[model samples]
Target: GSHMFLPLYFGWFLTKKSSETLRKAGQVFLEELGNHKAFKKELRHFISGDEPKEKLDLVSYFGKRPPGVLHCTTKFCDYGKATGAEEYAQQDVVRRSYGKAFKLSISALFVTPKTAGAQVVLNEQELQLWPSDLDKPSSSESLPPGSRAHVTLGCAADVQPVQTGLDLLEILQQVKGGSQGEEVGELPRGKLYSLGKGRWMLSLAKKMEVKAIFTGYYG
Candidate 1:
């Protein structure tokens, strides 16, 4: 008769040195218990944990296979699932936050001394108000005095190829411009704002089977 069971594994060195004693003890106990019919039933019930007849129709909501230790050479499909869409959301936040910060910092730099007065204040305000275009908890509009600020900006799954290209160009242009010694280096500074987040989106996109494009909005 064929029977199915879960297989267990241990190191061969450990098994030879220590596990053999325990294995032999277990075999002896099983052999002794097999003869007593009443005790056999109780033993089976204790070992089985759940009977075949009592097996529940399980609906698993979450699962992950143990990561393969051996390199897989054969073709295989990878399956994954996630709720809260947190990875996407976080990426979007970082990208958008980068853009907003970039634009605001540029505005701050280009602002004339006279313009700096209002622009600096507004930039600071925008920094406080913007939220990552990802799944972020809502916050109250009313800010306390000397309020701390936060920003999120990142790529979106739905971003268009053309728009993404344009953003890439803009980001590169900023980087190049920043590299050149300007009066204050607006382009480089802007690149600084978005570079880390842009890389993050690209990496995430590569991993998640999405076009690595970022989208952002201000609060």
Candidate 2:
């Protein structure tokens, strides 16, 4: 059994120490989000079934909680089947930076009813590894490379993990067009904004620099 295949998606994988700290902090942010009065009032946008009572259980809403170390998936190769995926894997820069240490900046934490993740702000060097056509599915004019960068935290019931990246692109599109989000007031950890349809984005007052290693995944 030889699994000498390309990574599921090559990017930077955060170290253990920083991963724990970020995960915990992310959870705390979610915890506080649920208790927010405005979020509670607008909870209807995030759910269905007409049951208008009880509490907000994000664990149930976001059924899959990724406990593994978080990383910003730079290029989702789809096993080299996606367009230009194999080319991305074959690039000299990809191999040259493999296993290299990197510090990724997390500028914002976002959660839609479908998925939850944090925004990754990549530098010029990091941008070299990002695929030019990652958002080809429904390209929005030009979404600016590296805009899809984000560390997935969770996904709602029946939601695909890939949605996190797609969701981030939507956010970035609005942002690029100068669409200011509806403010959800200041809160613990970061400043929150509402992007309609139960999509919440909390912009961190201070960016978090997490140490990671540029690498690939086999399993």
Candidate 3:
């Protein structure tokens, strides 16, 4: 006789319909952008691995026009496991399917400094170069130009992602100052330090750069 495992048993029961549910979920996502024919086409290209032949018009895809395109650097995390035991098995199946269907590409442009203390500036050439090691883990010392690690968010506008990126940069500056002299040691006193974190994102629609952020969850 088999001992009853409530969580696993219930999870197995729900797992039966998970694939169908996920496909429907993806379709629903496509449907929500009812008027985004070209945008949808781009998504299809991402799914199919067919690169876009022409320059992408990101504004038409997301529905709302953005103030500008922002290059942001932030923490990226994964959610492969469900919050509860009952939800776990089904969520795992959906997550696997999503990995195949979605194409997510978020990046950051580190502004090269003219001088050690001078303001950093974005380089167009740097942004255009694809990071050679996107498949590897995120690290600062070995990161090639244009190479960015993967990031995930609960939603696109989860609360000023751009502004938060800017703040972290200022914190880095304070840390640098504190290291230089004790008089400025108070600068990094309360700051949270991470082993490999640097850079920020800025919105520049007025400058007509990339123009907006395109995001969504497929699974």
Candidate 4:
């Protein structure tokens, strides 16, 4: 049940039509990666000692979720108790943009042994909704604004949806100094990078666009 007082977060929820389209696109991306020779070869290394490659099913491996609410978190308020939570809620921009439409650009799709997700490239207006402290876990001083923007496509077993944003931040850190792990390979879809620890990222050649509405989650 939602708290009668405040919300856990505020965000932009994707429209039903856009959600379906992005979900299908995510599936196709995973399927293609699974079939890619380079990705499969890396998967072999990602697996332990004698694990057979035939056992991996990228589609089912990453798992799936029923068509449901899809969103890009702006700020996790933690019910007004979190630092800056109450303050963020009072921001003029946040109040003005609520219940509005936005075109979120999906710059890329990324995967780690632990999760799968997409990266959102936000414009100036969208960035206004992003909390300055969102990347605090990684010390936002070194990261750019909107570093935590993403859509959780699917996740490996036991991985929480919140991990999606964390993973994206880690990747962006590597990007800042060109510290990304060795190049695994390049595909028609995008360039793949190895981030060690079974983490991999595919920077898309062409970013995808989707429509979403700026709103808050009361749960």
- For model 1, residues 1-219, the per-residue Cα lDDT tens digits are 677432121001111222233223222222332334443444444245454534321111000111111110111112113332233334343424432312211121111101001001224433333333312322332212111111112123333556543443343335345541122112211311223222211111111110111122121
By summed lDDT, the worst window of 10 consecutive residues in model 2 runs over 45-54
Q: Model 4: which residue pairs collide?
A: none
Question: Where in model 3 is the C-alpha error above 4 Å?
Answer: 1-14, 37-137, 140-219
Give candidate 1's TM-score.
0.15
Cα lDDT listed for each candidate: 0.23, 0.70, 0.26, 0.70
Off by over 4 Å in 4: 1-6, 49-54, 67-69, 132-147, 160-167, 181-189, 195-197
List residue ranges in candidate 1 displaced over 4 A.
1-155, 179-192, 195-219
Candidate 2 runs further than 4 Å off: 1-6, 44-53, 78-83, 132-137, 144-147, 161-166
The digit string of per-residue lDDT tens for model 2 on 4-28 reads 6556777777788878777767766
Query: Better model by TM-score, 2 or 3?
Result: 2
Instruction: Report lDDT (Cα) of residue 112, candidate 1.
Output: 13
Pairs with backbone N, CA or C atoms under 3 Å apart (clashes), candidate 2: none
Candidate number with the higher lDDT (3 or 4) = 4
Error of 3 at 92 (Å): 19
lDDT (Cα, 0-100) at 121 in candidate 3: 28
Given candidate 2, what's the lDDT at residue 111?
70
